[PDB]
Every structure is written in structure tokens, then in C-alpha cells.
Design a binder for this molecule. Structure first.
Ligand SMILES: *[C@@H]1O[C@H](CO)[C@@H](O)[C@@H](O)[C@@H]1NC(C)=O
Ligand SMILES: *[C@@H]1O[C@H](CO)[C@@H](O)[C@@H](O)[C@@H]1NC(C)=O
Lengths: 185, 185
């Protein structure tokens, strides 16, 4: 059963050598690209939160790029995500996607930057097919820990949104995964 | 298939109304009861770490008690653990077992106090049968998050030991779960 590659909004497969906006299936109010923001309650000296805009009628998202364990970007395979933007050089670290510590208010972990590439921690995601339209992101935190009788001894979860100060904040959810598309820039 | 009850070192089942030492199968140097200590690098104002002693030839453990979702203490069922000791009343909270945030050095989560009873977070454990001798503790953190295709959509892990400042610190492990016995006091 051959690994299936993830495609952009043009059919053309996903390339490590290129940058993409993670854009929303949902249209208008129901849409808004993923971007890099500052968490309302973060002590980080850089923007460290992963949000989507509240409508698609405003700014484009922040270009991300993907980093497989492989050579190519496939469905259902661990990878790193990283905002692909020039930074002031305190924040030079705060571009790699990561899943945070458990947040008691939201009872889930939230997406943030400050992650690492190549390492077995909280910085691994999966692209997969939505059960509805397009693609879902997964977060597979704790790759170093045997998740008992789980697929491949690995804990993974769907990536959705919670509302944090009236902004859409990507977080691990149980229902309504964010369905997304990748759009080269 | 009827729920199996967890028994102490006397055959008598485990009772919410009683206190137990979590003691080690291993003898001598290989033994040492679970106890309540202060983490070498904790900012907590109370002792907040779960350790076992380095030999069984020293002090007895700290009595814990168990708190089922049920009425009775069974194998393979979520429960809370709490040190059962009189406290100075800052620390009155710092007796309920909990699993910490991911620790990058050890690449796992560590056992600490500061947990809560009854709530869907990081304070849930399971008693089960060791694959070798006696009982293993499990930690099922993140009960609020759908662990995809995992048993009951729940991430669980074995509880073992790492060495933190030369003391034995209970933590989520992959191999060598701590095999234990419960001994009423
Ligand atoms: C991108 O750049 C390197 C340069 O050698 C190529 O080998 C190529 O395999 C990499 N991947 C793609 C999709 O271009
Ligand atoms: C302990 O105390 C209460 C008092 O009513 C009893 O109902 C009993 O069911 C509880 N459980 C055990 C094992 O004694």
C-alpha cells in the first residue's frame, strides 16, 4: 500500500522546497488562513501562537513549510511545520510549530511555536484527509512515550480551534477538525 | 467479564477507607517504597514529587489512598492517588498525584503532586497486573482528548523510574515498569 503524497490547491504535490498558506475550506466568515500571532497571555518574547483569521476577507496567512522524516511529504507521516518568514533574531527560534503544555481552562493543548526539527517531542504533526473536505492536521505529541495499544504505540489527536480572546486558536480537539488546503506562494 | 479487584499484601481487596504503602517487589537495594519528596528543581512551596527510596532497608513509604470513579477499586479503571498524611496547610493541596508537563531532559512526564480528584486532566492512574510480578501503575493523562484509535480513545502509559539527582523518580516509561505491592497500614 504505497504512501500517498499530500497535494496543494493545484494538484501539484507538497514540496519541502516551497512555502504554503494553510487555508480554510470554509468561505467568508467561516474562513481565515492559519497565521503566526502572539498569545494573549504569553510571556514569550516573540509571537508564539498558531491562529487562523476570523474571515478570509482579510490578510493572507503566514507561509509555512514542512519537514518530513522522509525525503518527501506524505499523508499520515510525522513531520515538522515551521512558519517560513524572515524574523528579528531573538525570535529566530519561534517559528517551528509545537504543541503546548496542557491548558486547564481549555482542557487541551494549544499550538505554539518554539518547537524543534528532527527530535522526538511535541513538534510532530501529520497531514491526513479530512472525513469531510480536504485535509486535517494531526498532532502526535510524546513520540518518546509508549502509548499502550495505540496505533504504533503513538498518541495522536485532531487539530481544531478554540476561541482565545476572540481569536481562533489552533488546539487539539475531539470534534470539528479544521479542514484545510495548502496553497503554494 | 467481571471487573477484577486489586488486592493488598494480604489478599484483602483495596479499600478507599484505608491507607497503603506502595512497596517494591524488588528486595534490598532493588527495593524502596514510593514516598513524597521535594523535586530537586521545583519552585513549588511544598514537596511535590513522587519518589521511591533507594533501599527497602530505610524508612517506610508515604501512605497513599485511592479514589475510584466507581465505588470500588478495580484493575484497569481510572482512579486518583493521594498521599494520606497530615500536612501544614499551605501544602494541603500538594498530596494528590498528578503527571507533570513534558520534561525534555528525560523526554517523559514525571509524577508529581498538585493533582485534582474527579476531574478529566492529568491526575488519573490505573492499577494493573505486572507482566512479571505484582502490580503496575499506569498514567492515563489527557482524558479530555481523543487519542485516535487508542483503547477507548485514551492515551495511557506505564509508570517506571528515572534517576533525578540520584533519587528514584517515578515517571512514564516504555520498559521496566515498576512492579508493586500495596500494604495496608
Ligand atoms: C529540493 O532540492 C534538492 C537539491 O538537490 C533536490 O535534490 C530535490 O530532491 C529537493 N526536493 C524537491 C521536491 O525539489
Ligand atoms: C466505606 O465507608 C462507608 C460508610 O457508609 C461504607 O458505605 C463503605 O461502603 C465504604 N467502603 C468500604 C470498603 O468500607
Amino acid at each position: 500500500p504505497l504512501p500517498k503524497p499530500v497535494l496543494d490547491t493545484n494538484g501539484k504535490e507538497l514540496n519541502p522546497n516551497s512555502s504554503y498558506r494553510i487555508i480554510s475550506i470554509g468561505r467568508g466568515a467561516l474562513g481565515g488562513d492559519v497565521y503566526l500571532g502572539k498569545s494573549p497571555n504569553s510571556d514569550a518574547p516573540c509571537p508564539d501562537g498558531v491562529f487562523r483569521y476570523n474571515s478570509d476577507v482579510g490578510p493572507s496567512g503566514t507561509p509555512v513549510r514542512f519537514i518530513p522524516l522522509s525525503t518527501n511529504i506524505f499523508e499520515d507521516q510525522l513531520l515538522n511545520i515551521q512558519f517560513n518568514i524572515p524574523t528579528v533574531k531573538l525570535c529566530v527560534s519561534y517559528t517551528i510549530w509545537k504543541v503546548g503544555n496542557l491548558n486547564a481552562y481549555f482542557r487541551t493543548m494549544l499550538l505554539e511555536t518554539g518547537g524543534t526539527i528532527g527530535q522526538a517531542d511535541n513538534s510532530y504533526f501529520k497531514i491526513v484527509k479530512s472525513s469531510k473536505i480536504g485535509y486535517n492536521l494531526l498532532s502526535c505529541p510524546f513520540t518518546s512515550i509508549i502509548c499502550l495499544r495505540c496505533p504504533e504505540d503513538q498518541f495522536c489527536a485532531k487539530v481544531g480551534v478554540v476561541i482565545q480572546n476572540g481569536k481562533r486558536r489552533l488546539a487539539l480537539v475531539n470534534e470539528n477538525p479544521l479542514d484545510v488546503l495548502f496553497q503554494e506562494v
